[PDB]
Amino acid sequence: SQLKLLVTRGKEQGYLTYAEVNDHLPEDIVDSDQIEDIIQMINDMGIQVMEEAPDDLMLAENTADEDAAEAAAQVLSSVESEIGRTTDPVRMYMR
Amino acid sequence: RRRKLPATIILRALNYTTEQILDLFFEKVIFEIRDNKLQMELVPERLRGE
Amino acid sequence: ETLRVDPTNDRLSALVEIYRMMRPGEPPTREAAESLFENLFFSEDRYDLS
Amino acid sequence: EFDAIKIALASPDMIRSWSFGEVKKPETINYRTFKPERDGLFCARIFGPVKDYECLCGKYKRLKHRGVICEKCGVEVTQTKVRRERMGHIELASPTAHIWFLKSLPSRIGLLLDMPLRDIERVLYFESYVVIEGGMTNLERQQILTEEQYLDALEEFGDEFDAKMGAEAIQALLKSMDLEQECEQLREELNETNSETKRKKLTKRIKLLEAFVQSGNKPEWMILTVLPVLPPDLRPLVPLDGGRFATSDLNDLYRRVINRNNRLKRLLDLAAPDIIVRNEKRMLQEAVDALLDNGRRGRAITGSNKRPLKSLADMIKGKQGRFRQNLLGKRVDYSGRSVITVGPYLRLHQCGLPKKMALELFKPFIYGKLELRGLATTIKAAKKMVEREEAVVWDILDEVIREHPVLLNRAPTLHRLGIQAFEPVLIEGKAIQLHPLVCAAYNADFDGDQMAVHVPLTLEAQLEARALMMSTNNILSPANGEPIIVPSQDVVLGLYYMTRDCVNAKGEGMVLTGPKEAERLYRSGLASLHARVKVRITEYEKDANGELVAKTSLKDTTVGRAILWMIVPKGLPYSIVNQALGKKAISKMLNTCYRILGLKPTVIFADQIMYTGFAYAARSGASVGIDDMVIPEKKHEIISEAEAEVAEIQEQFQSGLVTAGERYNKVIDIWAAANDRVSKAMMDNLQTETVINRDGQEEKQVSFNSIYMMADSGARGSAAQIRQLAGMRGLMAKPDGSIIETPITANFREGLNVLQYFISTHGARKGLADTALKTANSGYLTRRLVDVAQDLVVTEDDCGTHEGIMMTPVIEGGDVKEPLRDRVLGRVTAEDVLKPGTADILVPRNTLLHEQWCDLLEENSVDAVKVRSVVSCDTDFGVCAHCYGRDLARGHIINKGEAIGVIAAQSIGEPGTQLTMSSIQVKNKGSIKLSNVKSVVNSSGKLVITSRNTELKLIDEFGRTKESYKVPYGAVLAKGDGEQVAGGETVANWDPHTMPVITEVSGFVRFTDMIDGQTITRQTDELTGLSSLVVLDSAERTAGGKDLRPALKIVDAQGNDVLIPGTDMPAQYFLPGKAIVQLEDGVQISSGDTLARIPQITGGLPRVADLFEARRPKEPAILAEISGIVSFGKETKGKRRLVITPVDGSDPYEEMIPKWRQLNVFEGERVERGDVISDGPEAPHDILRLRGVHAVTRYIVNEVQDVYRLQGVKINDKHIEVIVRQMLRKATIVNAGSSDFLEGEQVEYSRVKIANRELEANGKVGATYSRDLLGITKASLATESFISAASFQETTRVLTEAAVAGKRDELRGLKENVIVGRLIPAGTGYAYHQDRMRRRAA
Ligand SMILES: [Mg+2]
Ligand SMILES: [Zn+2]
Ligand SMILES: [Zn+2]
């Protein structure tokens, strides 16, 4: 699962860009809301996925650091095993 | 700034085949093999850097 | 190397893949992909370099 | 009043008890007559009346009926303030999932039910079925069906198959759950079966269920059934002007939750088809989840403004919420602000204050005084009088102001001296006159800076602003004892100009008879202010026990010094005012006065110094002109020669004798040399230029050049800035970081042409940006530093311990960087200090080392003292006063109450804005001393040390260490050890290229187990014709001798292996790879020859932040866990496995040394724990685990203080140690001992210690623990008061965790009592808090 290595790369970089959080997504996700949910999950355990690469200004060290990390990781590792949006009450009614 | 896609996808989308893709960017190394001898259209420039 | 990484093989599949990359959820079509690709860069109404 | 805060889940019955009525309709107001609507969000009869003591009906409109409910509409006649505390409740048609307890991602509901978050999400959003009672059928509890399988099993069996969906199913699941039975069954399983995977998970689940059971909450309260609605006034609908209304977002959201709710009920009344009712239930769930926390999961609904509307979870959380309001908030009455000016006529305990700004701050006091003296009948007449400003109002104001101190503050309050208290002196203007000397504390300048004044109201506040915060009580910096009242720029110049001497001065040679005659001369116009004379001075000394004995003598001086001696207090020595008296001498004079006499004489002396300095700086008329910036006359020659050099190098490069990089470097070097030469020439021409002749030929003295006087006396300037004024500007940097090759070769007396100003501009812009960046980072550092340590408070008089740390002078690289007197002054000794011969008990073991004791210590050459330190203190929840030292701000000793944590954090953070990102040759006279030495005297007569920690110290005649140096392994020591030496004899010359395999015997070389071709490369150097049977690593040669050991050994001259003294192994050193074994077999050599020769940081705020955060460095120098003989096991994994076998203990230690790193441990060696094996940065964690608390504390203190002293900043050690105390305040239990502590767990060290103390007295054996080091950002996230932790952490997570666990917060910190509005437990309030303690202890 390239998602796990994406999380490790984000930890090693101290941050993740939107290009990074796009390249390593599953290639079968079509619904955007699932992408939003997974990026929110990553941000909850860290690291904040800003939209650009940005030296001597200290960033928030490890605010989202907690056991919540590993559990969050598990959630990510479980997102690839299945699929479903379920995040828009309009979409469920339409289906 | 949406997502990566192999840079040849658009080339195909522009109505270019794989042959056309290899033709536009890459040059050619033609072989005039006289059956045997593996006769190659070698040029001294190709040799440089080898 | 990019060609060896390219999953698609022809124009139709490439346009479908682009439509999936850009359009999050609507299934492909042999008119929808054409419209999206054309009216993104080559449309006189939605792309100006000046 | 109250004594604690308790938080827990709220039951539906509880919520119905809070509320005063159900909120049914969604309608707010009536849009024509703006009375609140009948039964909606703004309702009169639910949330009380609108107008004070007035029913909405309009019938009851008096204060007599108060308490009756108008039967016509039911509105209760009472205060409209009651419209700010009543709540309401909404009866939800169907249950709903409280989002906080679902999408928190430990998933409280998920943990409790043992269900993944996605499964419950499916069940809630109506896409599945969950079985609550499988029972007789095959299905089991918590088995998610699907819309097809459900009907399938219905066909199998209609009943016995309860499977609901939606929030109505999670509630049933949770209600059916029995916690005690499940935990019992989990215990049963845990005991019988034991596995790593199981035990941990099962124990954690048992802990969770027990925690929930003890909390008193029920599982199903996480599912809402009744929803509370906030009181109207907290979400108002205030009418703006023009008929336009303004409202807070909550109204919107509440409406969104009522409409849908009502609609749902209506559908249930019509028995609608279940598709639409499911959609309605999902909509209502979305509405509630947006109301509690908008945007948590579902793309927050947006208002008409297009912005995302806020919700209840954003009025608490967020930098803009009620929490974190103390980021910057709480405007304050009785306050003002204005610009500041100089006002040098003041004393340093009073400040000017405008009449207009003082008659406005003290209005209530003036009213009281007027109605007291009878000048005004009532208070209304008093207000009228004050507004007309009659004559008597000013007299009454002057009576009111007299003894009332007013606080003065400046914007960036970096340290506690930024708020002080002065006695107002009424001034007729509009600017706050601030005493000059105080400007240093505030860091204020008078170029437009503003200040804010606050008024203390009560009697306690007035007394505190007079005893704790007065400006005459804070003359010593809290970060170090050095005074903070040094006169700055005009008075130092005045005193420097007064206390000087000339060569032919009017009035030289006279013999005055005291200071008074010297003054009567200078003023009379008969002698110059600096003319060398003889004066009879009578100086006192308190050498006796408090008796000021006198001594009169004729001293050579200058009339200036004699005049200045008049203000000097009693028995200070005369030598204090016999010198040039720059900016250092004056501060030293003030410090000596403070340490000798006391406080009051010091403040009086400071005022007199200021007055005299200003007065005599005015007289000198020391102005600055364009003729004072004297250019050198040799500048042109120097620059021309430098140009010749650079042209020569450029020509050489054009001829291809150098690279572009080397041409650049050489040009830079020669231009730097030219700049240095020009600077030296200008300073030489500027300092002694004044040449004067006294009754004769000529004589050159120190110059009087106004610029030189201003720069030399310390007033303003330095060598660099004058060098820019008269010399050449020098070398300039460029955007990348490079330095432009050609320097600016002009000054500011001669203008810079167009091209050089561009480079100057780039430099200026970079500096301007950098200053803002610094000020941004320093604040962050100090905020984290106070967050970690804010509740530390001296809470005992003595802890009674004999621990401590061994203070010793710092000697790094060269000679002393800081003596022992500064590092030990004002710290309580832990154990008695003995003399060299030890002779006696010299210093008792609990003596505060003040100046006399430090001087006595330096009178016997002591260089090591075991002093008590905070980190090794012994009290719980505080620090013993003795264990801390003395209050460097007040001098005497720390008192019970001082909040040493906050002051330490401020002291460490304040200077943060100033920090910016071959052989051993003796240089002093002394005697040799090698420590940790095991050497062999080779046949060459030199010395090479076989030890690892060998180091060379220099010991004088007195015995004290003079200088320190590190002795490398294999270093050729021209000396021996402990012998004599003189400065000039290189003690040790060592080549860093070759690392020897030095042998211990001089005998035949022998290649045992050395197969050529399989364990050897047959190298042959054709230059010297050297046939080297070199040893390669285990990556190139074949498998024949793969693991074999190429053994270079020294045998005797006969052929028998020579045993190395000590063991049963001949000296067969096994060669590692790449060894340079030049000599082949058959040639005996000397003892200790190089047979086989082994071939070969940021300093700013980031460094301090990294140290305090305690992060693992990139290449941790590995350390030996357990002492013992070393060996290597497996190979080819990329990690040559290293093992240590103790002398007699077990040998389980193993590691995976990355082969990418080298090693300084030979295969055969018995290393000791805490010894370097590899090389690199030493992680603090490893130091703590191996060498203990003292080692880590010393490392952290010597790194941060190194960073600071690099820039000249002074900070005492107490502060860094108290910060390091709050890092290693957690322990990991190893052995459970006898108490009820888990095998592996992290607990606070205080609890462990009290438990062990209790056990050791009961009879059982104490527990075993190991301390742990944590950063300042992961240590503050351990606080045990959710009101504190919720103020700066993620509020939602803290609130949920506290709620489910049913925590009680008992206010015992400083943040908590600040938010709640009580007295902090730190200072004057400490006593009060203790009282409560005993009353509650009853
Ligand atoms: Mg200013
Ligand atoms: Zn009424
Ligand atoms: Zn102590």
Side-chain angles (χ1 to χ4, degrees), chain D residues 638-709:
Chain D
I638 297 166
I639 292 175
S640 298
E641 295 175 4
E643 283 185 357
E645 284 266 18
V646 310
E648 193 73 355
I649 290 290
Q650 174 67 353
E651 188 283 335
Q652 274 188 10
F653 168 86
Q654 279 194 4
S655 177
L657 285 70
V658 292
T659 58
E662 288 297 349
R663 170 260 177 182
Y664 168 83
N665 287 343
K666 178 50 174 170
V667 169
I668 271 200
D669 184 304
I670 60 183
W671 275 117
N675 179 15
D676 288 4
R677 291 178 58 194
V678 163
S679 182
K680 167 170 61 175
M682 71 155 280
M683 202 57 59
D684 295 356
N685 177 31
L686 188 69
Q687 66 183 2
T688 66
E689 198 61 15
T690 304
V691 44
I692 311 186
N693 42 340
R694 172 52 158 91
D695 57 60
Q697 331 84 359
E698 246 178 26
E699 175 179 347
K700 65 182 185 181
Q701 59 187 38
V702 284
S703 174
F704 276 85
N705 210 75
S706 53
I707 251 164
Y708 175 81
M709 285 205 314

Side-chain angles (χ1 to χ4, degrees), chain D residues 3-25:
Chain D
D3 210 333
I5 306 280
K6 171 163 180 57
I7 197 179
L9 273 308
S11 67
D13 300 323
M14 176 68 80
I15 300 184
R16 296 202 189 92
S17 71
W18 293 341
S19 66
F20 287 87
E22 182 180 343
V23 171
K24 295 169 188 172
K25 301 184 185 65

Side-chain angles (χ1 to χ4, degrees), chain D residues 1168-1301:
Chain D
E1168 325 307 342
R1169 89 182 303 183
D1171 187 327
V1172 297
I1173 310 302
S1174 175
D1175 290 339
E1178 304 192 15
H1181 304 77
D1182 302 330
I1183 305 238
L1184 181 278
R1185 180 160 38 73
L1186 285 319
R1187 298 175 205 165
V1189 176
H1190 293 331
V1192 57
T1193 219
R1194 171 160 62 260
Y1195 172 78
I1196 297 177
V1197 172
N1198 275 9
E1199 247 62 9
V1200 170
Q1201 279 218 123
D1202 172 16
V1203 171
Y1204 275 92
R1205 267 192 288 90
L1206 169 58
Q1207 266 291 351
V1209 179
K1210 279 282 290 184
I1211 284 171
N1212 200 269
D1213 304 331
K1214 304 174 175 59
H1215 307 335
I1216 294 157
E1217 289 177 349
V1218 59
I1219 286 289
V1220 170
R1221 168 177 172 88
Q1222 288 286 117
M1223 288 167 56
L1224 46 79
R1225 65 158 189 165
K1226 196 167 268 63
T1228 55
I1229 306 301
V1230 176
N1231 170 19
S1234 302
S1235 54
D1236 54 1
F1237 271 134
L1238 203 142
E1239 161 56 18
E1241 186 184 7
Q1242 272 196 346
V1243 287
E1244 296 205 4
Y1245 169 69
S1246 66
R1247 203 198 187 288
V1248 174
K1249 261 297 172 204
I1250 62 177
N1252 283 13
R1253 237 93 66 82
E1254 176 174 2
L1255 293 194
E1256 292 171 356
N1258 281 334
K1260 304 185 186 180
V1261 316
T1264 308
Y1265 59 81
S1266 179
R1267 212 79 82 88
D1268 185 2
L1269 189 80
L1270 309 88
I1272 58 176
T1273 193
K1274 181 151 62 280
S1276 55
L1277 282 53
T1279 54
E1280 310 301 349
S1281 182
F1282 64 86
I1283 288 173
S1284 178
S1287 62
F1288 66 91
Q1289 307 180 11
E1290 188 182 7
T1291 299
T1292 61
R1293 202 281 308 288
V1294 174
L1295 263 283
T1296 49
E1297 180 172 348
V1300 299

Side-chain angles (χ1 to χ4, degrees), chain D residues 288-303:
Chain D
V288 161
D289 293 8
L291 181 269
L292 300 190
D293 182 359
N294 188 23
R296 185 54 167 269
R297 55 141 185 74
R299 195 74 166 186
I301 64 195
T302 58

Side-chain angles (χ1 to χ4, degrees), chain D residues 152-172:
Chain D
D152 178 10
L154 284 179
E155 299 160 17
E156 298 179 3
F157 18 67
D159 296 9
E160 306 79 35
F161 184 41
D162 261 2
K164 298 84 168 292
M165 63 191 295
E168 296 174 347
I170 307 305
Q171 160 172 324

